[PDB]
Structures are given as C-alpha cells and as structure tokens.
Symmetry: D2
Subunit: 497 residues, 4 copies
C-alpha cells in the first residue's frame, strides 16, 4: 500500500524528516512509561549505595538487584508496574519481604524528581544533537550561496540587497545562542536530588555523592527541600524549547513567503511538500506549517508549568505540571523537518537577482552616494531619492533603469537645484551586486564577510559537537560503572554467601 | 495628612518596601521615555565613531555633539522629541542641516535594538542587585534560626521536623540558580547590534567595535539581520522574571499559610500588614498577596513576546511585543517587599515546636527505628506505625504521648507478633529535635549541616556582589570614556577651528 | 493484585472518580482517532445529499455507502485508514473507481472542520453533563448544611461567620454562569461548514442545508472562507475549560486548606485521599492536587490555539493548534473527582463553630452594634473594636469571652469616653450563630436566605438538564435519520437495480 | 512643528485612526484613576439607599452627598484621594464625623468589584461600538467589490477564484460572532455585587435591588461570596478581546501579504503607511504591524488573570490580576486603525484578475468539468489535471493558455486514453470569472450570493446598533435617576431641616 497523499504534484515519497511530523503524536510515550527505565536505574544505584554504607547486607542487596531485573522485564509488558508502589509490591511478590528495604532513606518524592531529571537530561542531549544538525545544515547551505544575491526584508517589504548565505548565517547565530541556553540548562538539570527523601533528608547515613555519581549527575541538589520542591529546571526546559521553536517558526514563515506563487524566489523540495485532495495545482508547504504548529504548541507546557508553580508553596506538590515526552518529540520532529527543508531548498537565483535589481532595494546606496559625493546631509539626500522612487513608480521605470535625467529632475523638483553626480555613479549605486560587495564589514552580506562568519561558525560547531560528545560519554561511563557494581554484588553473593 | 489605611490593627506606617507595591504602577515610565536617554548616548557614541572614521569633520561632529545636549534638555520637557525622527528634526532646527549626518550608516532599527538593550541591561543589574538583597536577607535570617524547630510541609500536610533556617536555605539555593539565569542572560543582552543599520549593514566604513566599546557592550551581535531581527534576549528576560517570581510567589504563599489564624506559626511585622475597612480584627497579608499578583502578571509579557515572535519571519518587525518598564518595576517592588517580609518575620517558636512534637511528623523516625532495631523491611514497619497513628488519633493521643503499649498493640494487631523495642527507643524516635539532629547529611536540617550551607551561601554571595560590582563598573568606565571623547571633540573644534 | 497505593491510612479502594485522574492520560485518543468516526458519518451524509441532488446515481451511492461500512471496520484495527486520503484509497481498493466520487464538491478542509466540530460537540455535551453533576452535588451538599456555622475567609484570614451551605451556593452560582458559557459556545460549535469545500465553495449544486441537518447541526457556517478558516470556537472551547477549571482549582485549594492539620475543619473521605511511601501519618489530598494540576494544564491549549491564530492569515491553515481529547478527558476526570470530593466531604462541625466563636470573626457585628445603638459613625466604632481585639489578643481572651469591661476600656482608651451598650448587646453581637441569622438578605448565609438560593438553583438545574436532554436527543434523531436514509438507498439499489 | 515621520513616500498626515496606535500607551489611565469616578457614583447610590432604608437621616445623607461633590473635585487634582480610605478620610475632614456612616453595610471588597464592573461595562459598550464600526466598514467595502475577482489563499498558496467582497464577508461573519461573545459577556458583567460587603453580607437591612438599579445593573450577583470572589467576567473580557484581536491580526497579516512588493494586489492608503529613516523606497505597513502587536499583547492579561485565579481559593483576594485600561485602549486603537485600513484600501484589480487567470487557481473547475462531462471519478480527473499543471509549468504556459492539446496529452500520458471534452469546455472551465459565477450556493463568491450575505449583514448590523443603543440608554437613564435622587435629598434637607 503506497502513501495515498503522494498524488499529483506531491511526487515521490515524503522525506523521512517530513514524515516525523505525522508520526510523533501517536508514538509518544506517557511520562510514566518514559521515566520508568530511569527509576529502575535509581533503584540499582540506591541499593548499591545502601550496601556500601552497611545498611543492606550483600545477601539482601544481591537478592534485590536480581529481582529488579525480573520485575523490569515484567514491566516491559505490564504497565501497571511502572509506578513505584506497584513496582515495589511486584518485587515483594518476586523475592520476598526484603524488597521493602530498597526504599530505606528514600521517598517517591526524590525518586520521581531524580528520575524525571534523568529523562529530561537524555532528552536535552537529544535536543542539542538535533539543534546541532539544524545549524550544520544551515551553515553548510550558506557556504554554497555566497553569490546568491537576493533582497532581505523588513516589515515584509524589500529592504536592501544581501545573499542567501548572509541570511542563513543570521539563523546560525540564533542557533548558537539557543545552544548556549540549552547547555546552561543542562548544568541545572544534571543535579541529583536523591538523599532528600520526602523533603527533609533522613537519619540513615546515605552517601549522596556516590548515588549521584553512579547515575551520571555532575553534582547535587544540596538542600533537601529544593531537592523535591525544585521545579525551575522544568519551566526553563519548556522555555528554551519555546523560544528556540519561535525562531524555527520565523524561518519556516520566511521560507513560506519565499515559496508563495507571488514571490517565487524559492521552492520546497518535492519531498517536503504536499498537495490538495481537490486542487490539483497545489504544492503545499505542509512541512513548514506543521513545524510552526509545533512551535505554537510549545507555548502550552511553558504556561502550564509556570502557572502551577505560581499556584503553590515551596513544597513538594502533586499539582505541578510536567514537561511531557510528546512535547519534546514534537520539537525534534520539527527540528528534523526544517533541517531537511533547509538542506534541500531550491532557491530561484534568477528571480532573486531580478527583484534585487528592479524593485528599488538599492535606493539606500543611491542616497549614500549623494551624501558621499556632494556632501549633503542624509535627510536631504533621502528626500531626493524618495522623489526618484515615487516618479519612477509613476512612470513604470524599474530601479535598474533609473538614470541621470530622473535623478536630476528629482533634485530640481525637490531643492530647485541640480546635483553633481555622474551616470556612472548612479549606475554603480543601483547595481545590487555592488550593494552587496560594499557591505563588507562584520556581519554584512559581502562574500568575504559571510565567509568569515562561516569559518567562525564551523569552529563553534566543532565545539558544540565536542561538548555533546563529552556529556554523552560521561553518562555512558557512569551507566557502565553502575552496571559493573551491580554484577559484582551479585557475583560476590553467588560466590561466598 | 496621614496614611488613611493605617487604622486599627494596621499600626505604624507601611514599611517603605511595602509601600513600593502601591507606587510602581502610577510611577512607571513608558518604554519610549525610559529608552530615550540611552538613544542620546548612542547618538554621541555613533558620531564619535563617524568622526574617528573620517566620515564627519571635527567641525561637523562638534556642532552635532553640542546640539545633542541642547535637544536632550528640550526633550526633558517635550516628550514629542523622545522618538528618533522628531528628535533629528529638532536637532536640525537647532544646529542646521548638518544634523542629518548623524544618521549616516544607521537606522532606527539598530538604534532601537541597541537602545532597548542598554535599558534592559541597566534594569538587569538593578534586578540582580535586588535579588542579591533578597538572598542576603534570606541567608541572614536563616543564621538566626538554626534551632527553630518546625515542621516542613508536603502537599500542604505536615511531613517531618526541620528548622526555619533549613527552610530558608532552600530559598537561598533557588535564588542562587536564578542569579545564574540572570547573569547568563546578561551576556546575551550586552551585545551591540549597531552597525547593522536597517538589517544589511552599510557601505560606510564603520568601526562597530569602537561604537560597541563606547556604549559598554562586551561584544557584538555580528550578523546584521540578527542585529535587528534578534529578540530572544527579550523573551528570555521575561522568562527569568517569570520563573524567579514564581518562586517568590511560593514563599509568599508559604508565609501566608504560616500566618493564617489556624497555623499561627508565624506573624507578619505590622509594617508589612494591613487591615480591613469593615472587619476590625483583620491583620491582612497585603504585602504577600500583591507580591504574588506581580508574579502572576509577569506571565503576560512572556506570552505576549513569544506569541509575537511566533507570528512573524526572521526580520525586523514593528509587531514584536516588548518588555516594558512597569513589568520590571513590579518585580523590583515585589522583591523589595519580600526582602523586608523575610527580614522582619516573627516566627512563633513555641507553637512551631508544639506542632512538631504533637502532630505526628515524627512517625518516619519511629518507622526507621523499627527497621534499624529489629531488621524488618520498611514497608512492614510502615504499616505498623500507620496503625499507631490511626489508633492514636482515634484515642486523642498526641504523638509525643505515644508509648510502648500503643506500639506493641499496633504490631500485634497488624502482624500478630510483638516487636523488640524499648520505651527509650520510642521516646528518642518521637523527639522532634532528635529528628532534626539525626538529619545531618548534606542539605538536611541539622544545625551543623545548615550552618555549612550558610557558609557556602555567604561565599557565593560575596561572588554575586563581586560580579555585580564588576559589571556595573565596566559600564561606568565606558560611559565616562564616552563623555571624555565627546568633550575632546568639542574642545578641539573650539580651540583650532 | 490489589491497589498497592492503598496502604496505611489510605484505607479501602480509590473512589472511581478519584481513579479517573490516574487513567485518562494513558487512555486518551489522538485527535485523529477521536474524529475518524465522525468523518465516516460525514461521508454518508455527504453521499446521501449528492444522491438527492442527482450528482450520484443510486447504484453509485449504494456501492459507496456499503463500502464505507467495510472500510470503517478495517479502520477499527488499521489506524492508517483514519485520515482521509488513505481511507479514500482503501475504499477504492474495496468497491472500485466509484469511491473517488464521494469527494465531489468537497475538500479535506471542510471535512476536517466539520468532523472536529462534531467531536467537540459531543465532548461539549459530555462536559455540560459532568458540570451539571458537579453542581448537583454542590447544591445537594448545601441543603444538608444550612446550620453548619463556620467562618468565611478573605485573603486567607477569618472574616465573618457563615455556613457551609452558604459557601457551596457561591460555587453553584459560579457553575451556573459557566454552564451559560458552555451553552453559548455550543451554538457556535454546532454550525456546519460543509459545502465550503477548499474555501470557496463549488460549482456542484450541493444542498448544504440537507447535509447540515443530517449531521445534527442547527445551522450553517455560511461564508465558505469562514467555514474552513473559522477557528474561534476552538479557542473559546479551550477558554471556558480554562476559566471553569480555575474555579474548580479554587474550591480544591479551599478544601485543601480546610483539611490541613492546622485548620482541621474538614476531612477528605478516605476514598479521595492517599498516603506516603515513607511517612505513615500522611493522609494526602491527592484528589485535590491532581484536580488543580488539570486546571493549570488547561492553560496550555488556550495559549497554543490563540498563538496559532495570531500567527497566520484568515485562511485555512495546517499550522493551527487543536483542542485535543486528552485535555478534555482531564477536565472530565477532575470534574468527576471534585464531584465526589464534595459529596463525601466530612466537615468537622464542632471545630468550625469553635473558630467562629473564638477567633474574632464576630467583631464586625460588635462594630455595627455600636453604630446602631449609640449612633457613632462606622470609622469611630471600628477603631474602638480594633482596640478590643488588640487588647483581647494581648490578654489571651477568646472573642466569646469579650465582655462589657473590655469594651468600655477600649472606648475610654480610644475616645476618653465610655459607651452606652449593655452586656447583653455585646453577648448577642459576639454570638456567631446570631451573626449568621442577622445576615438574612439576598445571598447571605442565614438559613432562610440560603434555602431560597437552593430552591432557585434546583429550578435552574431542572432547566440545565432539560437543555442537555433536548440537545442530546436532537443529535440522536439526526443520526437515526441519517442511518435510515443510508439503508433506504442501499435497499432501493438491491431491489430495483 | 510637523509630523517628522511624514517624509518621502509617507505623504500627508497620518490618518487619525492610524495615529491612535501611537498615543494610547502614554495616555492610558491607571485602573485606580479609571475606576474612581464610578466609586463616587456608588457612594451616592449607596447613601441614597441607606436613606430610603432609614439607616441615615436626611440631614446625614444630604451632608454626605454634598461632601462627595466637594471631595470629587479635590480628587480631580489630588490622586491620593482616588482610593477609598483616603477618600473617606478627606470626606471626614470636609463634612465631619458623619462621613464614616457612608460605609455602613459596605466594604472595599464589594465597592471595588462593583466599581470595576461599571468601568468594564462602559469599556465593553465602547468596544462593541468600535467592533460595529469595524464590521460596517468591512461590509460597506464588500458592497463595492462584488466584481473584484481575485484568488483566495489556503496555506499561503493560491487556491480558487473569489472576489474581494466575498473575502470581506468572511470577516463580517467572524465579527458577528465576536459581537455575540461581547453581548453575552455584558450580561455577566452587568450584575451588581453591592450588598455582599466583605463577603458575607451584613445585618443592616439593605435594599440591594435599589442600589443595583440606581447604578444601571440589570440584576444582582446574588451570593455574597460570589459578589467579592467572582472574577470570571474579568477573565472572559480578556479572552474575547484576545480572540477578537486574533482575527484582526489575521486580516492585518492577510493585507500585509497582499501589499508586499511581490503580490502587489493591494496597497495601503498613504495615510495608513509610513516610511524608513534610511531606505527611501519603503512604504511600510506600520498600521498593520502595530495592530498585530496589540493583538499579541492581549494574550498577556488573559494569562495573568487566569493564572491568578488558579493560584487562590474561592475568596476575595488582593492577588488577582486585573484587566487594565491600557489593554482595552490598545484594542480600540487597533480596531479603529483596521477600520480605516479596510475603508481606504486600494485593491489592484487588474493584477488580482491576472493572478486568477494565469496562476492555475482554476484547475479545480477543469477537474470538475471532466467528472461532469465524461463521468470519471474525481481522483482520476484530479491526477490528469495535476499532470496538466506540471507540464504547463515546465513549458511556461499560463493557465489561461491551457488548451485541448495539453489536456489530451495529460490524459494519454496518465491513462493511455484520450478524453471527450471540447476546447470550449476547457476555455469555460479556465475562465476565472466563470469560476466565480458557478460558485453561487450559500456563502460562495458569486455576486448574487455575496449580495445576499451583505443584505443579511446589513440587517444584523441594524440589530447590533439597536442592542447597543438600548444598553447605552439604560445606563444613561439610571445615571440620571440617581442624580435626581441625590438633588432631591439635598433639596429636602435645605428646605425643611
Ligand atoms: O486537501 C485539500 O482538500 C485541500 C488542501 C489545500 O487547502 O490546499
Ligand atoms: O477593607 C475591606 O473592606 C475588607 C478587607 C478584607 O477582606 O479583609
Ligand atoms: O509517597 C511519598 O514518598 C511521599 C509522599 C508525601 O510527600 O506525602
Ligand atoms: O526607519 C528605519 O530606519 C527603517 C525602517 C524599515 O525597516 O523599513
């Protein structure tokens, strides 16, 4: 059975990244099912620490640890075992009364806070990975379009000539700062609240540092109230998602206008567009609009979470709103979709140049030339060139057809006086590519300036990947260190007891 | 004329911090009037750079710079001159046509982005200052209440014994992370977009680094589109305000419950409470409720800003929502009010202790003691002690009156078997102060543990103040460097030209 | 296997309404799966109308209609068939090329708008039913507590004496107005956009009224753009949900304070409370806090939907955010939970009376008595009684122990003059039940006044149920009328063709 | 001094409605100053009722009423007198101790709730007036453009031919339903809470109906708790503002795309456009973007209000967020601005027609013609015409140049078979005006169908104005009835006492 939406102008298959936008909602896990595997890691790390602190015997610990493996497999198909007390009771039915001792010095409150942090932690690295891939495609695309002259817009009106590469590097700088936000957030998510128990700690002599290290945390949530009442990292995760996706909506919207039947300065790759069930001419920006949809929806969790925090005391509370898997899955799908949109975008270079040459985005350079050549102030030069545009539009004269006669008329009609410039000055001022070349300072569209920004971004991207690789490897090491400690307890018991 | 609200139980005057909550709304500036002084600084810094780049003659520059001082004073009483083009036109009427040259290589777009950043920058240091003062009062208050035994709550139910000092250090840790958020934000606000002009830079050879340095920025917004389209720092400023104030609402709510007629474990200082026009018995938490009001209201700008970014392209746009002075003023007023609330709070130490001793928050330690002494698992010990509580409540027996007989009954009724513990074990387990002393690990309420957290917080507070002092001094130095460069141009012209 | 959370003080099973709060998230349908059955109703109603308009032959219509039944059953187990074009293609594979004719004069745009309206329509009647059951329990509970004297609070401080019945009838009036909001919304949801096709209608001679009537709509969305671009009913549905649940959060919060260990003026029924895995004394308000959680979360869809509308043009758009089943399911679960909370709530009548008599909520009546008996203005009487309270608190004198001596002292100390009232006047003024009886105007807590409000509410509830019964029956009639028309076409073909 | 922004292409003056967008922020009142005049009306109405109930003597009443006039005039220049207790104290200093008796049976709680309702009530009629003027301009504009053929868009892609009049009547239907929302809200705002006093009523025998009638309310908020705790009408006012403005943003956005340099199918009137300080060619949609800005900002109050309600109990609370004058003023300014935008919009009729004829929006009619003429199913006809478009685009053939040859090729290439249609069938199918004429059902763009919608809208507008006139006159009558009752008391005292 084929994809029934790939009819008419919707040729070929959906790009896989495009298809993600349609699949994440039905495939998303509940928070309970997403967090459960991390809870079972906490059970092991907590039991190991209890053993090392002499609170559990090795026999007790080994019996518990082996039971966890059994119940975990039961919970793979029995969802009722994915919350704590049902899980603890199933462990009791599996290994006996000793199961109850794994909760010594512990509560559902610090267990849940820690487990949710571990889930958000992995999802944050997953997000940073996707955002890096987004930035990579943006920069790589820019490197191929240093000569792609086109107009930049302000207030949805043509402003001045730039290049497509110059535009994309604005997105690169946006993404660099959102990656900073995410990395800054990671340092606050990756703190271990275990040891706070209900909210006040415990009399049992826990080693909170050992539990934290075994679970991959880089530090503690120290105060025990903050350990269970702390929720700002959840709100912040929701916010960075929201603000990052607002910039993704803006690019999607920008490309959607580029790809209107009226602009026709860019076209979506067939693999990122759909069509209509009724209108055969439609090549619809489904990828862009469903990406924006996800950006709008990300407003919801942010408001729900902050509302819930505004509604309570500084306590553990079951009334706090969560950041759910389906919200994060939507962000990833949208980020992947726009990664592919950018990679496969087809700019219409000729029409881009045509607009730059014909639709008066070069008038600023004409104004600047008057100021530079004859020394009038900018406001006076501005009034003259404005008159040029008004007259040119009235007469149907494209910007690249503006000449000495029209400029002299405007100056006379506006000041009563001619103005001392040549037809070559005017010609050079109205050449959109010369407009680009002259804008060669930092962050400006001249190829050498955009090229420099690309070089800096490629260096920053290397550091982005390095930060991600180190954070990921640190978690993998701790997770392996924990698995080793678990088997060693089990082997010690099997061998000597 | 006296404060007519200070009647009956509302004795004395409002604390000044309390009064701030009533004054900020009517006293708040428009964004235009708040940003205008920074725009005039930009005019000077931009003109200086134009002069150093040989774009303006010294005569032109000096004439402009002296005119700015004149128009600035006019704008002190003529609000119509607080937007750019009216200001430029007034400068033209004051010094002549040369006024128009101060806009060379510049736009309202990068002028406004930079000016708003300078405003938010100062307001961010103002906020960091206030939050530091908030944390100082919280830590200083904690240092005086290491022995103030009281219950901590979870889900608005008494949980376990702690101390007031232990609770306040949860707030200290919350504020430390919000100070990190604010400092992280500062690095993104303190970037200079000047030189982007409309959105694509300019052909004029500007020195963007010089303009940035003269205005106190620590770096550039490089890409010219990002310079004018960039708005994420505004959304982020709104967010940190929102999440920080949500924690302030939670403390306000916590104290409001403490100070209910039913809890009576704390009382507001008369200078932070009001009364009713009809009910003479009322001592109302006006300070707390208007502080929460400001926290709820801070949700608004965050949503408005993010909505506006989700609604546009990655362009300069006049449709973007701003963070306004009155919102920031509300945060400061609430932060100052809660600073004073915490400083002057009157805890009722005797009733705090009474609840800890009588209302069963010590049952966990009783449970832990069974596990420790006889070795039963925690779940079984938990069921027994639960039976103790049920029976004690039925019989009207306060927790500190629970003895050997009642514990043995519960064990028998629940397991058919007695349990091997002494009356001294039970007595020690139900002593709320011993509950506190036993919780002596990291972040737990034992005095030595809270004392350690205070010591660390005092060290962190020293670094908070140091970061603030350095950031503030850097702006003062640049502002003085700019004033010097302005006079030197004016003096050079007066002397030689 | 038993409910492992029902341990210790969590006796018995969860009330079913309580359990709903734990089940709705994992059980919720996607919007696609929830809307799909309504789409298949639209296919039938649209085909019937095409037949009656002579666009389809009876043979064609009968073949299509019988195929719909076959594909519907396939889609019961094949989720891929729950969007239109896969469904249309499966119908094609089932009955042949004629399947494509069911889309004549139609689009996915007006099909989806109509199908989602039908879904929200049924969910709105479901919500109105639940809210009615909520109000019924509130009023019925009030009828049993006309004598249950207790204090009302303002700003979380005891204010004046009322009754529990009086408080609950405030909730009844709140719910009456939310039922008006919902009924007003229903009239805007129950409009049929079918016939708009893509956005501009069609050349085919459709009978839009017939399609609308067959699907239970009470009218048309006339303009074809509004038919597909119209989305305000979705935003409004989200809003009424949000504001209704904010009042439910406020009642939940009110009861949670009542049931604190410090108030102890009400207690949750065991079937609506939980306990702690660590603290055996906990009787936790899980029902209340998860109900508030749902109220906070309802903020999310409202913001997401409105953001998406603010982000587009007045067009059909795939970027619009939806109101999803899981959000509505959460509201129902919370409404059912609070319905049972109210029904089974255990007020502590004796302690309610004690607070009313002892904690100075009667001071207003004492003030009013001075004004009435000696004729002083209210502000002067207020200052005297305030002095009474201050002195009584200082001396540890409960309000019901205030006598002639203390009142005369305050008057002297405050005015230098005694005051002409008797000890019987004071006694009557400080009697909390007399406070209630004297408040006998409209909407006041006196039994006869609350009884009147109950009578009016019982009459309004009869009209609520009548409106719901009529709306529900109208849909059932249209749905049966449609099923009949479908079989008749099928029978006509089988018999004559 | 001229408007310095009216330079270059920004010719003439701003339209006054355009200028409103720049003035409302600095001119907006605080809520305190906006509500104060209504509070003084309440003082009079409450005193009158106290007199009629025999609680005040005529001498007392007359002395108070005359003092109110004096203090009101003082408060015109002394803002400190615009809150109750300062006002009451100034009245005391003016007429003596008797001033305190105006507060008998009353609180700041029900005074403030009622006063804010009266303010929102007037602002709601002001809003309904503005929205009516908005709808009038939309319908009147539509009546002049029944022949203005143009394409409608879906997903920002050309869809099918319509007319400008047809598009505007979608807005008319949107506004009709928002007027229903506002009128429905009015019935809930226009309820009087006076008589609730603090929250529990009073022992004084007030006539709540008389006070309500004197102040223009159409009924009571009955229950006294609901009278002071009730806030849903504030949230609802914020919501209708938000959803109404979201539709205004969508029209603004739609027109902004129409007026891009690339569409060029409409142009703003010079009086609703601005220009750039740097780019002389700019004709900027400042009116549209600042209108959308106000729509985004309206999200803020809605979220702040609902958050505050979610944060409290069902009590009077000072923590509740308000709907402020500046938010309402922004809506009015945006509504007035878009009223003028629509009135003065310059459609480019020739280019509108050109797009309709050339850019393939007529392909649906071509598809429908195949189905109608040869009887193939719609999906097969759709695939053929899709092939026509693909081939036509490849060959650069405008839609109106598609002929018999190209259609036969597509049919052959796609089915191997020709198709039995004439060149005249194709020609008629591709004629965009015939596309419009054929869409003649209800709500479709055919002139006779749009004309009918206009006739119905003109009838509905007459009823809109009639509802507004009646509501306004009812308030004017009550306000005059109150002024008369005040003088009569004053005259009775002056004459006989
Ligand atoms: O699939 C449809 O029926 C319409 C799609 C569109 O609006 O382009
Ligand atoms: O000032 C009043 O009238 C009431 C205050 C309160 O509710 O406590
Ligand atoms: O279930 C727990 O571990 C704690 C519950 C509570 O905070 O009361
Ligand atoms: O006024 C300016 O400087 C730029 C305006 C624009 O972006 O069009």
């Amino acid at each position: 059975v084929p994809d029934a939406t790939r009819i008419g102008r919707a040729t070929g298959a959906k790009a896989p990244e495009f298809q993600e936008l349609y699949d994440f909602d039905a495939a998303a896990l509940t928070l309970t099912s997403a967090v459960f595997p991390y809870d079972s890691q906490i059970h092991r790390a907590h039991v190991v620490m209890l053993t090392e602190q002499g609170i559990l015997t090795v026999e007790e610990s080994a019996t518990i640890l082996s039971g966890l493996a059994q119940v975990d497999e039961l919970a793979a198909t029995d969802g009722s075992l994915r919350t704590y007390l049902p899980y603890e009771a199933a462990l009791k039915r599996t290994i006996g009364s000793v199961a109850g001792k794994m909760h010594i010095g512990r509560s559902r409150n610090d267990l849940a806070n820690a487990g949710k942090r571990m889930f958000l932690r992995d999802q944050l690295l997953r997000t940073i990975e996707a955002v890096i891939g987004y930035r990579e495609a943006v920069v790589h695309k820019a490197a191929d379009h240093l000569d792609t002259v086109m107009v930049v817009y302000t207030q949805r009106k043509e402003a001045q000539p730039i290049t497509l590469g110059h535009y994309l590097m604005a997105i690169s700088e946006n993404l660099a700062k959102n990656l900073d936000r995410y990395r800054e957030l990671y340092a606050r998510i990756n703190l271990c609240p275990l040891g706070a128990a209900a909210t006040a700690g415990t009399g049992w002599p826990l080693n909170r540092d050992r539990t934290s290290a075994l679970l991959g945390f880089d530090g503690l949530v120290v105060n025990s109230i903050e350990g269970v009442a702390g929720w700002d990292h959840v709100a912040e995760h929701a916010f960075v998602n929201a603000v990052f996706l607002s910039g993704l909506s803006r690019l999607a919207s920008e490309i959607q206008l580029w790809s209107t039947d009226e602009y026709q300065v860019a076209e979506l790759d067939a693999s990122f567009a759909g069509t209509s069930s009724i209108m055969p001419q439609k090549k619809n920006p489904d990828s862009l609009e469903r990406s924006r949809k996800a950006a709008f929806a990300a407003m919801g969790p942010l408001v729900g979470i902050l509302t819930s925090l505004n509604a309570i005391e500084y306590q553990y509370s079951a009334a706090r709103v969560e950041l759910e898997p389906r919200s994060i899955d939507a962000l990833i799908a949208a980020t992947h979709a726009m990664t592919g949109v950018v990679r496969t975008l087809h700019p219409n270079k000729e029409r881009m140049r045509q607009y730059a040459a014909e639709n008066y985005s070069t008038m600023t350079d004409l104004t600047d030339m008057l100021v530079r050549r004859v020394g009038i102030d900018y406001r006076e030069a501005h009034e003259i060139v404005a008159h040029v545009v008004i007259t040119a539009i009235e007469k149907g004269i494209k910007a690249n057809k503006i000449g000495l006669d029209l400029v002299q008329e405007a100056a006379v009609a506006q000041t009563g006086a001619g103005i001392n410039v040549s037809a070559d000055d005017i010609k050079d001022a109205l050449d959109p590519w010369q407009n680009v070349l002259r804008r060669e300072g930092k962050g400006m569209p001249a190829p050498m300036s955009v090229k420099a920004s690309i070089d800096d971004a490629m260096a920053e991207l290397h550091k982005d990947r390095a930060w991600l690789a180190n954070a990921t490897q640190a978690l993998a090491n701790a997770k392996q260190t924990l698995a080793d400690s678990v088997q060693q307890i089990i082997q010690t018991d099997r061998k000597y007891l």
